[PDB]
PDB file of C-alpha atoms and ligand atoms in Angstrom:
ATOM      1  CA  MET A   1      80.567 105.253  93.705  1.00 23.21           C
ATOM      2  CA  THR A   2      80.762 101.436  93.915  1.00 25.73           C
ATOM      3  CA  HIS A   3      81.089 100.294  90.299  1.00 23.87           C
ATOM      4  CA  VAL A   4      79.052  97.328  89.078  1.00 19.41           C
ATOM      5  CA  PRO A   5      81.331  94.645  87.623  1.00 19.37           C
ATOM      6  CA  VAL A   6      81.746  95.202  83.872  1.00 20.55           C
ATOM      7  CA  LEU A   7      79.070  93.441  81.762  1.00 20.47           C
ATOM      8  CA  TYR A   8      77.792  91.671  84.849  1.00 19.43           C
ATOM      9  CA  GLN A   9      74.479  90.284  83.547  1.00 19.20           C
ATOM     10  CA  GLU A  10      75.900  89.461  80.146  1.00 19.44           C
ATOM     11  CA  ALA A  11      78.853  87.533  81.602  1.00 21.21           C
ATOM     12  CA  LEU A  12      76.702  85.627  84.107  1.00 22.87           C
ATOM     13  CA  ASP A  13      73.997  84.761  81.554  1.00 23.90           C
ATOM     14  CA  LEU A  14      76.704  83.410  79.202  1.00 24.82           C
ATOM     15  CA  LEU A  15      78.144  81.328  82.064  1.00 23.04           C
ATOM     16  CA  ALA A  16      74.699  79.737  82.407  1.00 20.97           C
ATOM     17  CA  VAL A  17      75.208  79.049  86.095  1.00 18.87           C
ATOM     18  CA  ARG A  18      73.231  76.162  87.595  1.00 20.29           C
ATOM     19  CA  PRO A  19      72.988  75.318  91.314  1.00 19.38           C
ATOM     20  CA  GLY A  20      75.594  72.773  92.292  1.00 18.85           C
ATOM     21  CA  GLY A  21      77.866  73.666  89.401  1.00 18.34           C
ATOM     22  CA  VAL A  22      81.522  74.603  89.939  1.00 18.51           C
ATOM     23  CA  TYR A  23      82.824  77.769  88.277  1.00 18.00           C
ATOM     24  CA  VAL A  24      86.258  79.266  87.958  1.00 16.76           C
ATOM     25  CA  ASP A  25      86.544  83.033  88.282  1.00 15.64           C
ATOM     26  CA  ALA A  26      90.103  83.255  86.990  1.00 12.12           C
ATOM     27  CA  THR A  27      90.429  86.986  87.848  1.00 13.16           C
ATOM     28  CA  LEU A  28      88.628  87.230  91.209  1.00 10.68           C
ATOM     29  CA  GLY A  29      89.530  90.843  91.993  1.00 10.28           C
ATOM     30  CA  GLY A  30      86.984  92.279  94.401  1.00  9.50           C
ATOM     31  CA  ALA A  31      84.722  89.283  93.738  1.00 11.71           C
ATOM     32  CA  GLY A  32      82.048  91.315  91.963  1.00 15.62           C
ATOM     33  CA  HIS A  33      81.248  88.666  89.355  1.00 16.01           C
ATOM     34  CA  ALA A  34      81.934  85.852  91.805  1.00 15.92           C
ATOM     35  CA  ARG A  35      79.132  87.114  94.093  1.00 17.62           C
ATOM     36  CA  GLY A  36      76.768  86.827  91.134  1.00 14.73           C
ATOM     37  CA  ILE A  37      77.708  83.216  90.509  1.00 17.26           C
ATOM     38  CA  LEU A  38      77.251  82.379  94.187  1.00 17.39           C
ATOM     39  CA  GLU A  39      73.825  84.072  94.135  1.00 21.18           C
ATOM     40  CA  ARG A  40      72.827  81.782  91.277  1.00 20.67           C
ATOM     41  CA  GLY A  41      73.786  78.753  93.347  1.00 21.11           C
ATOM     42  CA  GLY A  42      77.123  77.830  91.845  1.00 22.29           C
ATOM     43  CA  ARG A  43      80.318  77.261  93.752  1.00 20.02           C
ATOM     44  CA  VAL A  44      83.332  79.404  92.827  1.00 17.10           C
ATOM     45  CA  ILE A  45      87.065  78.707  92.715  1.00 13.97           C
ATOM     46  CA  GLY A  46      88.554  82.179  92.466  1.00 13.95           C
ATOM     47  CA  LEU A  47      92.122  82.876  91.468  1.00 17.08           C
ATOM     48  CA  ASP A  48      94.080  86.094  91.748  1.00 19.60           C
ATOM     49  CA  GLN A  49      97.785  86.775  91.728  1.00 22.99           C
ATOM     50  CA  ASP A  50      97.483  90.122  93.532  1.00 22.31           C
ATOM     51  CA  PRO A  51      98.121  89.498  97.239  1.00 23.32           C
ATOM     52  CA  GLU A  52      95.953  92.485  98.129  1.00 21.67           C
ATOM     53  CA  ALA A  53      93.003  91.077  96.175  1.00 22.86           C
ATOM     54  CA  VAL A  54      93.490  87.654  97.728  1.00 23.15           C
ATOM     55  CA  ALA A  55      93.497  89.111 101.253  1.00 22.33           C
ATOM     56  CA  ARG A  56      90.470  91.286 100.586  1.00 26.33           C
ATOM     57  CA  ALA A  57      88.498  88.447  98.941  1.00 22.60           C
ATOM     58  CA  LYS A  58      89.095  86.158 101.903  1.00 21.34           C
ATOM     59  CA  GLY A  59      88.072  88.930 104.289  1.00 17.75           C
ATOM     60  CA  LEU A  60      84.662  88.814 102.638  1.00 17.75           C
ATOM     61  CA  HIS A  61      84.002  85.238 103.926  1.00 14.96           C
ATOM     62  CA  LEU A  62      81.643  84.358 101.093  1.00 13.29           C
ATOM     63  CA  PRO A  63      80.192  80.856 101.451  1.00 10.26           C
ATOM     64  CA  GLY A  64      80.878  78.676  98.407  1.00 11.42           C
ATOM     65  CA  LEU A  65      83.971  80.633  97.396  1.00 14.10           C
ATOM     66  CA  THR A  66      87.420  79.056  97.453  1.00 14.47           C
ATOM     67  CA  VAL A  67      90.173  81.667  97.003  1.00 12.46           C
ATOM     68  CA  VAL A  68      93.418  80.586  95.373  1.00 12.18           C
ATOM     69  CA  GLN A  69      96.406  82.915  95.285  1.00 14.34           C
ATOM     70  CA  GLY A  70      98.149  82.311  91.973  1.00 12.47           C
ATOM     71  CA  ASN A  71      98.487  82.924  88.239  1.00 15.96           C
ATOM     72  CA  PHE A  72      95.775  81.691  85.921  1.00 18.68           C
ATOM     73  CA  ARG A  73      98.422  80.342  83.596  1.00 18.85           C
ATOM     74  CA  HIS A  74      98.667  77.462  86.120  1.00 17.77           C
ATOM     75  CA  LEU A  75      94.910  76.916  86.108  1.00 18.03           C
ATOM     76  CA  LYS A  76      94.896  73.181  85.396  1.00 12.09           C
ATOM     77  CA  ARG A  77      97.576  72.488  87.962  1.00  8.57           C
ATOM     78  CA  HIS A  78      95.870  74.536  90.670  1.00  8.06           C
ATOM     79  CA  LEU A  79      92.441  73.020  90.004  1.00  8.87           C
ATOM     80  CA  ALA A  80      94.002  69.565  90.166  1.00  6.74           C
ATOM     81  CA  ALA A  81      95.417  70.466  93.589  1.00  9.26           C
ATOM     82  CA  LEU A  82      91.868  71.240  94.766  1.00 12.96           C
ATOM     83  CA  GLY A  83      90.837  67.839  93.447  1.00 12.95           C
ATOM     84  CA  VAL A  84      89.137  69.232  90.341  1.00 11.41           C
ATOM     85  CA  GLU A  85      89.622  68.040  86.749  1.00 12.64           C
ATOM     86  CA  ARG A  86      86.472  69.492  85.120  1.00 10.41           C
ATOM     87  CA  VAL A  87      84.439  72.625  85.769  1.00 11.46           C
ATOM     88  CA  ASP A  88      81.098  73.884  84.513  1.00 11.72           C
ATOM     89  CA  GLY A  89      82.200  77.331  83.498  1.00 12.53           C
ATOM     90  CA  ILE A  90      85.101  79.737  83.465  1.00 12.03           C
ATOM     91  CA  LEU A  91      85.229  83.518  83.600  1.00 10.77           C
ATOM     92  CA  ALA A  92      88.123  85.971  83.128  1.00  9.49           C
ATOM     93  CA  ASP A  93      87.715  89.774  83.414  1.00  6.15           C
ATOM     94  CA  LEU A  94      91.224  90.876  82.401  1.00  4.75           C
ATOM     95  CA  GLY A  95      93.229  93.756  83.803  1.00  7.68           C
ATOM     96  CA  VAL A  96      94.542  95.106  87.095  1.00  6.73           C
ATOM     97  CA  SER A  97      92.643  95.214  90.406  1.00  5.25           C
ATOM     98  CA  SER A  98      91.148  98.209  92.214  1.00  4.36           C
ATOM     99  CA  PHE A  99      94.292  98.370  94.337  1.00  2.00           C
ATOM    100  CA  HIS A 100      96.493  98.339  91.259  1.00  2.00           C
ATOM    101  CA  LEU A 101      94.773 101.468  89.980  1.00  4.25           C
ATOM    102  CA  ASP A 102      93.897 103.357  93.174  1.00  3.87           C
ATOM    103  CA  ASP A 103      97.107 102.641  95.052  1.00  4.14           C
ATOM    104  CA  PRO A 104      99.833 104.734  93.443  1.00  2.45           C
ATOM    105  CA  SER A 105     102.399 102.699  95.387  1.00  2.00           C
ATOM    106  CA  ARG A 106     101.896  99.794  92.990  1.00  2.93           C
ATOM    107  CA  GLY A 107     103.248 102.016  90.182  1.00  3.89           C
ATOM    108  CA  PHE A 108     100.635 101.307  87.530  1.00  2.39           C
ATOM    109  CA  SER A 109      99.617 104.907  86.800  1.00  4.57           C
ATOM    110  CA  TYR A 110     101.499 107.408  84.663  1.00  5.46           C
ATOM    111  CA  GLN A 111      99.455 110.127  86.411  1.00  5.08           C
ATOM    112  CA  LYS A 112     100.000 109.262  90.095  1.00  6.44           C
ATOM    113  CA  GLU A 113     103.507 109.263  91.527  1.00  7.64           C
ATOM    114  CA  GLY A 114     104.760 105.916  92.796  1.00 11.37           C
ATOM    115  CA  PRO A 115     107.781 103.580  92.314  1.00  8.96           C
ATOM    116  CA  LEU A 116     107.966 101.833  88.922  1.00 10.28           C
ATOM    117  CA  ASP A 117     106.794  98.414  90.017  1.00 11.43           C
ATOM    118  CA  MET A 118     103.878  97.324  87.813  1.00 12.49           C
ATOM    119  CA  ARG A 119     103.830  93.679  88.935  1.00 14.35           C
ATOM    120  CA  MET A 120     100.264  92.497  89.627  1.00  8.05           C
ATOM    121  CA  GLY A 121     101.780  89.732  91.690  1.00  7.70           C
ATOM    122  CA  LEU A 122     105.269  89.102  93.053  1.00  8.59           C
ATOM    123  CA  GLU A 123     106.851  87.355  90.114  1.00  7.60           C
ATOM    124  CA  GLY A 124     109.853  88.703  88.213  1.00  8.48           C
ATOM    125  CA  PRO A 125     111.806  91.958  87.880  1.00 10.36           C
ATOM    126  CA  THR A 126     109.948  95.266  88.330  1.00 13.93           C
ATOM    127  CA  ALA A 127     109.307  97.827  85.571  1.00 10.09           C
ATOM    128  CA  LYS A 128     112.110  99.847  87.232  1.00  8.33           C
ATOM    129  CA  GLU A 129     114.709  97.150  86.384  1.00  6.95           C
ATOM    130  CA  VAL A 130     113.328  96.709  82.893  1.00  6.98           C
ATOM    131  CA  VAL A 131     113.551 100.427  81.937  1.00  6.63           C
ATOM    132  CA  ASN A 132     116.974 100.898  83.527  1.00  6.93           C
ATOM    133  CA  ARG A 133     118.568  97.720  82.123  1.00  3.69           C
ATOM    134  CA  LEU A 134     117.144  96.598  78.764  1.00  2.00           C
ATOM    135  CA  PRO A 135     119.402  97.414  75.823  1.00  2.00           C
ATOM    136  CA  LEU A 136     118.000 100.087  73.505  1.00  2.00           C
ATOM    137  CA  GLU A 137     117.066  97.537  70.841  1.00  2.90           C
ATOM    138  CA  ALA A 138     115.165  95.312  73.299  1.00  5.90           C
ATOM    139  CA  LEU A 139     113.428  98.330  74.811  1.00  6.58           C
ATOM    140  CA  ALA A 140     112.221  99.559  71.412  1.00  5.32           C
ATOM    141  CA  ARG A 141     110.978  96.077  70.462  1.00  7.83           C
ATOM    142  CA  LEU A 142     109.061  95.819  73.744  1.00  5.52           C
ATOM    143  CA  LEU A 143     107.342  99.198  73.172  1.00  9.23           C
ATOM    144  CA  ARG A 144     106.594  98.436  69.538  1.00  9.44           C
ATOM    145  CA  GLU A 145     105.336  94.890  70.078  1.00  7.48           C
ATOM    146  CA  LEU A 146     103.498  95.221  73.361  1.00  7.91           C
ATOM    147  CA  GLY A 147     102.461  98.871  73.182  1.00  5.10           C
ATOM    148  CA  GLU A 148     101.916  99.194  69.415  1.00  5.12           C
ATOM    149  CA  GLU A 149     103.998 102.340  69.916  1.00  8.25           C
ATOM    150  CA  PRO A 150     104.821 104.063  66.556  1.00  6.72           C
ATOM    151  CA  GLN A 151     107.620 106.108  68.143  1.00  5.44           C
ATOM    152  CA  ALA A 152     109.239 103.132  69.893  1.00  3.29           C
ATOM    153  CA  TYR A 153     112.791 103.919  68.945  1.00  2.00           C
ATOM    154  CA  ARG A 154     112.506 107.602  69.780  1.00  2.00           C
ATOM    155  CA  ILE A 155     111.052 106.850  73.201  1.00  2.00           C
ATOM    156  CA  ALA A 156     113.550 104.066  73.862  1.00  2.00           C
ATOM    157  CA  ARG A 157     116.395 106.428  73.017  1.00  2.00           C
ATOM    158  CA  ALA A 158     115.012 109.062  75.390  1.00  2.00           C
ATOM    159  CA  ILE A 159     114.700 106.466  78.169  1.00  2.00           C
ATOM    160  CA  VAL A 160     118.293 105.375  77.637  1.00  2.00           C
ATOM    161  CA  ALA A 161     119.474 109.022  77.598  1.00  2.00           C
ATOM    162  CA  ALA A 162     117.725 109.732  80.897  1.00  2.00           C
ATOM    163  CA  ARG A 163     118.732 106.513  82.707  1.00  2.00           C
ATOM    164  CA  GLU A 164     122.379 107.045  81.707  1.00  2.00           C
ATOM    165  CA  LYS A 165     121.996 110.336  83.575  1.00  2.00           C
ATOM    166  CA  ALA A 166     120.333 108.931  86.702  1.00  2.00           C
ATOM    167  CA  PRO A 167     118.109 105.907  87.453  1.00  2.00           C
ATOM    168  CA  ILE A 168     114.497 106.238  86.360  1.00  2.00           C
ATOM    169  CA  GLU A 169     112.589 105.446  89.528  1.00  2.00           C
ATOM    170  CA  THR A 170     109.042 106.729  89.507  1.00  2.00           C
ATOM    171  CA  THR A 171     106.012 106.549  87.262  1.00  2.00           C
ATOM    172  CA  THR A 172     105.917 110.335  86.972  1.00  2.00           C
ATOM    173  CA  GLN A 173     109.584 110.568  85.964  1.00  2.00           C
ATOM    174  CA  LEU A 174     109.057 107.926  83.260  1.00  2.00           C
ATOM    175  CA  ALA A 175     105.863 109.639  82.139  1.00  2.00           C
ATOM    176  CA  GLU A 176     107.618 112.986  81.751  1.00  2.00           C
ATOM    177  CA  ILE A 177     110.498 111.376  79.866  1.00  2.00           C
ATOM    178  CA  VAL A 178     108.037 109.868  77.380  1.00  2.00           C
ATOM    179  CA  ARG A 179     105.945 113.046  77.227  1.00  2.00           C
ATOM    180  CA  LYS A 180     108.983 115.173  76.334  1.00  2.00           C
ATOM    181  CA  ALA A 181     110.001 112.703  73.626  1.00  2.00           C
ATOM    182  CA  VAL A 182     106.592 112.436  71.985  1.00  2.00           C
ATOM    183  CA  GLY A 183     104.816 115.725  72.655  1.00  2.00           C
ATOM    184  CA  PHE A 184     101.147 116.025  71.799  1.00  2.00           C
ATOM    185  CA  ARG A 185      99.200 112.865  71.069  1.00  2.00           C
ATOM    186  CA  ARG A 186      95.489 112.874  70.196  1.00  2.00           C
ATOM    187  CA  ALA A 187      94.539 109.326  71.185  1.00  2.00           C
ATOM    188  CA  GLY A 188      95.798 109.569  74.748  1.00  2.00           C
ATOM    189  CA  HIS A 189      98.680 110.857  76.858  1.00  2.00           C
ATOM    190  CA  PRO A 190     101.988 109.954  75.178  1.00  2.00           C
ATOM    191  CA  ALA A 191     102.952 107.715  78.100  1.00  2.00           C
ATOM    192  CA  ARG A 192      99.925 105.410  77.900  1.00  2.00           C
ATOM    193  CA  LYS A 193     101.279 102.980  75.324  1.00  2.00           C
ATOM    194  CA  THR A 194     104.663 102.799  77.045  1.00  2.00           C
ATOM    195  CA  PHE A 195     102.958 102.029  80.378  1.00  2.00           C
ATOM    196  CA  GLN A 196     100.735  99.387  78.796  1.00  2.00           C
ATOM    197  CA  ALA A 197     103.718  97.674  77.140  1.00  2.00           C
ATOM    198  CA  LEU A 198     105.707  97.659  80.346  1.00  2.00           C
ATOM    199  CA  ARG A 199     102.744  96.282  82.283  1.00  2.00           C
ATOM    200  CA  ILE A 200     102.258  93.466  79.728  1.00  2.00           C
ATOM    201  CA  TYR A 201     105.984  92.697  79.688  1.00  2.00           C
ATOM    202  CA  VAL A 202     106.511  92.722  83.451  1.00  2.00           C
ATOM    203  CA  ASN A 203     103.549  90.387  83.937  1.00  2.00           C
ATOM    204  CA  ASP A 204     104.060  88.340  80.747  1.00  2.00           C
ATOM    205  CA  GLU A 205     100.348  88.928  80.178  1.00  2.00           C
ATOM    206  CA  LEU A 206      99.948  87.628  76.657  1.00  2.00           C
ATOM    207  CA  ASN A 207     101.688  84.292  77.168  1.00  2.00           C
ATOM    208  CA  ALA A 208      99.962  83.805  80.551  1.00  2.00           C
ATOM    209  CA  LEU A 209      96.667  84.453  78.744  1.00  2.00           C
ATOM    210  CA  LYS A 210      97.349  81.966  75.920  1.00  2.00           C
ATOM    211  CA  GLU A 211      98.279  79.278  78.449  1.00  2.00           C
ATOM    212  CA  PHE A 212      95.206  79.971  80.612  1.00  2.00           C
ATOM    213  CA  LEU A 213      92.935  79.833  77.540  1.00  2.00           C
ATOM    214  CA  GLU A 214      94.128  76.382  76.380  1.00  2.00           C
ATOM    215  CA  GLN A 215      93.945  74.962  79.895  1.00  2.00           C
ATOM    216  CA  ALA A 216      90.494  76.476  80.336  1.00  2.00           C
ATOM    217  CA  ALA A 217      89.220  74.832  77.166  1.00  2.00           C
ATOM    218  CA  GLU A 218      90.607  71.506  78.331  1.00  2.00           C
ATOM    219  CA  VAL A 219      89.070  71.507  81.828  1.00  2.00           C
ATOM    220  CA  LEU A 220      85.578  72.648  80.783  1.00  2.00           C
ATOM    221  CA  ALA A 221      82.949  69.944  81.259  1.00  2.00           C
ATOM    222  CA  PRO A 222      80.667  69.150  78.253  1.00  2.00           C
ATOM    223  CA  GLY A 223      78.463  72.145  77.517  1.00  2.00           C
ATOM    224  CA  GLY A 224      80.517  74.393  79.783  1.00  2.00           C
ATOM    225  CA  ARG A 225      81.142  78.026  78.875  1.00  2.00           C
ATOM    226  CA  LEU A 226      84.445  79.976  78.728  1.00  2.00           C
ATOM    227  CA  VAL A 227      83.744  83.732  79.098  1.00  2.00           C
ATOM    228  CA  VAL A 228      86.462  86.394  78.683  1.00  2.00           C
ATOM    229  CA  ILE A 229      86.278  90.194  78.888  1.00  2.00           C
ATOM    230  CA  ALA A 230      89.208  91.818  77.138  1.00  2.00           C
ATOM    231  CA  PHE A 231      90.095  95.537  77.421  1.00  2.00           C
ATOM    232  CA  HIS A 232      92.939  96.315  75.058  1.00  2.00           C
ATOM    233  CA  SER A 233      93.692  95.481  71.432  1.00  2.00           C
ATOM    234  CA  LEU A 234      96.490  92.984  71.955  1.00  2.00           C
ATOM    235  CA  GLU A 235      94.710  90.818  74.484  1.00  2.00           C
ATOM    236  CA  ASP A 236      91.362  90.942  72.699  1.00  2.00           C
ATOM    237  CA  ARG A 237      93.107  89.690  69.532  1.00  2.00           C
ATOM    238  CA  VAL A 238      94.670  86.811  71.456  1.00  2.00           C
ATOM    239  CA  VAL A 239      91.242  85.880  72.844  1.00  2.00           C
ATOM    240  CA  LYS A 240      89.558  86.220  69.450  1.00  2.00           C
ATOM    241  CA  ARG A 241      92.128  84.059  67.628  1.00  2.00           C
ATOM    242  CA  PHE A 242      92.253  81.447  70.373  1.00  2.00           C
ATOM    243  CA  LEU A 243      88.501  80.952  70.420  1.00  2.00           C
ATOM    244  CA  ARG A 244      88.167  80.577  66.632  1.00  2.00           C
ATOM    245  CA  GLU A 245      91.195  78.248  66.378  1.00  2.00           C
ATOM    246  CA  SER A 246      90.288  76.252  69.477  1.00  2.00           C
ATOM    247  CA  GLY A 247      87.556  74.004  68.160  1.00  2.00           C
ATOM    248  CA  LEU A 248      85.168  75.247  70.864  1.00  2.00           C
ATOM    249  CA  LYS A 249      81.754  76.463  69.623  1.00  2.00           C
ATOM    250  CA  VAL A 250      82.136  80.268  69.428  1.00  2.00           C
ATOM    251  CA  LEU A 251      79.014  81.869  70.912  1.00  2.00           C
ATOM    252  CA  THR A 252      79.960  85.460  70.156  1.00  2.00           C
ATOM    253  CA  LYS A 253      80.950  85.972  66.501  1.00  2.00           C
ATOM    254  CA  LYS A 254      81.244  89.637  67.462  1.00  2.00           C
ATOM    255  CA  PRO A 255      82.299  90.766  70.960  1.00  2.00           C
ATOM    256  CA  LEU A 256      79.626  91.945  73.391  1.00  2.00           C
ATOM    257  CA  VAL A 257      80.156  95.533  74.473  1.00  2.00           C
ATOM    258  CA  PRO A 258      78.641  97.610  77.310  1.00  2.00           C
ATOM    259  CA  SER A 259      75.671  99.924  76.735  1.00  2.00           C
ATOM    260  CA  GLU A 260      76.498 103.622  76.549  1.00  2.00           C
ATOM    261  CA  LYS A 261      74.853 103.853  79.959  1.00  2.00           C
ATOM    262  CA  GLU A 262      77.314 101.403  81.477  1.00  2.00           C
ATOM    263  CA  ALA A 263      80.138 103.034  79.532  1.00  2.00           C
ATOM    264  CA  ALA A 264      78.888 106.353  80.885  1.00  2.00           C
ATOM    265  CA  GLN A 265      78.789 105.132  84.484  1.00  2.00           C
ATOM    266  CA  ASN A 266      82.060 103.146  84.484  1.00  2.00           C
ATOM    267  CA  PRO A 267      84.870 104.461  82.242  1.00  2.00           C
ATOM    268  CA  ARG A 268      86.980 101.307  82.626  1.00  2.00           C
ATOM    269  CA  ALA A 269      84.076  99.537  80.957  1.00  2.00           C
ATOM    270  CA  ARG A 270      84.297 101.528  77.729  1.00  2.00           C
ATOM    271  CA  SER A 271      86.962  99.374  76.029  1.00  2.00           C
ATOM    272  CA  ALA A 272      85.383  96.094  77.180  1.00  2.00           C
ATOM    273  CA  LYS A 273      84.935  93.278  74.692  1.00  2.00           C
ATOM    274  CA  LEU A 274      83.264  90.111  75.984  1.00  2.00           C
ATOM    275  CA  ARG A 275      83.688  86.870  74.022  1.00  2.00           C
ATOM    276  CA  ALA A 276      82.477  83.379  74.924  1.00  2.00           C
ATOM    277  CA  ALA A 277      82.577  79.819  73.599  1.00  2.00           C
ATOM    278  CA  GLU A 278      81.184  76.447  74.579  1.00  2.00           C
ATOM    279  CA  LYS A 279      82.701  73.007  75.092  1.00  2.00           C
ATOM    280  CA  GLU A 280      80.605  70.514  73.163  1.00  2.00           C
ATOM    281  CA  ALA A 281      79.378  66.910  73.277  1.00  2.00           C
TER     282      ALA A 281
HETATM  283  C1  SAM B 301      89.395  93.644  86.390  1.00  2.00           C
HETATM  284  S1  SAM B 301      90.007  92.841  87.891  1.00  2.00           S
HETATM  285  C2  SAM B 301      88.608  91.776  88.347  1.00  2.00           C
HETATM  286  C3  SAM B 301      87.372  92.417  88.872  1.00  2.00           C
HETATM  287  C4  SAM B 301      86.359  91.323  89.227  1.00  2.00           C
HETATM  288  N1  SAM B 301      85.754  90.770  87.975  1.00  2.00           N
HETATM  289  C5  SAM B 301      85.279  91.917  90.122  1.00  2.00           C
HETATM  290  O1  SAM B 301      84.113  91.889  89.730  1.00  2.00           O
HETATM  291  O2  SAM B 301      85.688  92.410  91.221  1.00  2.00           O
HETATM  292  C6  SAM B 301      91.150  91.614  87.334  1.00  2.00           C
HETATM  293  C7  SAM B 301      91.872  90.814  88.424  1.00  2.00           C
HETATM  294  O3  SAM B 301      92.634  89.827  87.723  1.00  2.00           O
HETATM  295  C8  SAM B 301      93.838  89.567  88.365  1.00  2.00           C
HETATM  296  N2  SAM B 301      94.728  88.976  87.378  1.00  2.00           N
HETATM  297  C9  SAM B 301      95.192  89.505  86.195  1.00  2.00           C
HETATM  298  N3  SAM B 301      95.973  88.698  85.517  1.00  2.00           N
HETATM  299  C10 SAM B 301      96.031  87.546  86.305  1.00  2.00           C
HETATM  300  C11 SAM B 301      96.705  86.290  86.141  1.00  2.00           C
HETATM  301  N4  SAM B 301      97.466  86.028  85.070  1.00  2.00           N
HETATM  302  N5  SAM B 301      96.566  85.315  87.103  1.00  2.00           N
HETATM  303  C12 SAM B 301      95.783  85.595  88.200  1.00  2.00           C
HETATM  304  N6  SAM B 301      95.105  86.748  88.464  1.00  2.00           N
HETATM  305  C13 SAM B 301      95.271  87.698  87.465  1.00  2.00           C
HETATM  306  C14 SAM B 301      94.284  90.914  88.976  1.00  2.00           C
HETATM  307  O4  SAM B 301      95.227  90.849  90.033  1.00  2.00           O
HETATM  308  C15 SAM B 301      92.946  91.661  89.113  1.00  2.00           C
HETATM  309  O5  SAM B 301      92.547  91.571  90.507  1.00  2.00           O
END
């Protein structure tokens, strides 16, 4: 009915906020976690590429919060433009915003009709252009690599068959095309993996993440904490590998996961994996 930010206390405790400190909330969203950092006395530089989240966040007029519209893969550059080279802590709660999920017009849901857009921000071609133009081979690779889709070729072929008939324009048309090609699927609706892959591709999520992570490690002041909450297999693996290969002190050998109570209350929270590391010296 409101939804407490995922792993709120765990994330904040790991950030070890101290009054006067400066923290980066790299995925501001509705500012749920940011509010917690402000409450603990830290200042927050919050980034978000979704124009609707940026507008909303600013409309909250929270003292101590600086909102930056932009992609976290430009973190170092944007902090430098605010006159900041080091920060005390960094948080990233990955995924789409409330608007992305509750506003069918953004085209993120295979269940709610809307145009195939899927861009969290305003950068690059839409999912519509990707599904109507990528050659079969490229399409299948995208589904396989970014969606871990076992029936990548079969789905890609169905998408090509349909688009050669008429442009694929809506989430529900794409979802039905994938559903007809796959049929029953135990794990989740047959269109889920395809939608996830297209979302990752359209937003170049994995590379943006890898770039943000290395810049985050660099700008952390001594003893500062990098805290990331991952929600799907591919991004959690990127976070896990980065942290262990980074040289940072890994604080969470195993990811922190929400209690069944939190999982019960907030479904989105069920696949959450929180990992953190510390900058030393
Ligand atoms: C799960 S929501 C954040 C919810 C937030 N923790 C709260 O408590 O309200 C993630 C936000 O990250 C943003 N986001 C995702 N990838 C991004 C990127 N590469 N650069 C900037 N913002 C990004 C989205 O637009 C979305 O608003």
